[PDB]
DNA sequence: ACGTACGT
DNA sequence: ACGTACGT
């Protein structure tokens, strides 16, 4: 759920 | 030389 | 001359 | 329910 490298 | 994850 | 960064 | 981010 977090987006720091994928954002899902 | 750049540091964006290792910085060497 | 190498690896850091998050939760829904 | 998954991967992005740089050059000395
Ligand atoms: C986001 O909160 C989140 C949490 N756990 C995960 C596990 C695997 C892929 C995506 C994820 N996203
Ligand atoms: C993004 O590509 C990415 C990859 N691995 C991680 C690990 C822990 C926190 C954040 C991350 N983001
Ligand atoms: C920094 O400018 C730089 C450039 N190329 C590299 C290759 C391998 C490890 C470290 C590096 N750092
Ligand atoms: C840092 O851990 C890291 C890893 N791979 C990269 C690829 C391209 C640009 C920056 C990067 N930084
Ligand atoms: Mg460490
Ligand atoms: Mg891409």
DSSP of A1-8: --------
Which residues put CB within 7 Å of chain C, the nucleic strand? A 1-8; B 1-8
Please give the Cα distance from B5 to B2 (Å, whole number): 9
Please give the Cα distance from B1 to B8 (Å, whole number): 5
Helix (H, G, I), strand (E, B) or coil at B2: coil
Please give the Cα distance from A3 to B1 (Å, whole number): 26
Please give the Cα distance from B2 to A5 (Å, whole number): 18
What distance in angstroms lies between residue A1's CA and the mean position of ligand 1's atoms? 5
Please give the Cα distance from B3 to A2 (Å, whole number): 23
Measuring CA to CA, how many Å separate A3 from each of A6, A7, A8, B2? 6, 4, 7, 23
Token pair 């987006």 in the structure block, residue: A3
**Contact A3 CB / ligand 2 (< 6 Å):** no
Experimental approach taken: X-ray
A3 dihedral zone (left: phi>0; alpha: psi -120 to 50; beta): beta
Cβ distance B1 to B8 under 8 Å? Answer: yes
**Contact A5 CB / ligand 2 (< 6 Å):** yes
């Amino acid at each position: 759920x977090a987006x720091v490298x994928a954002x899902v």
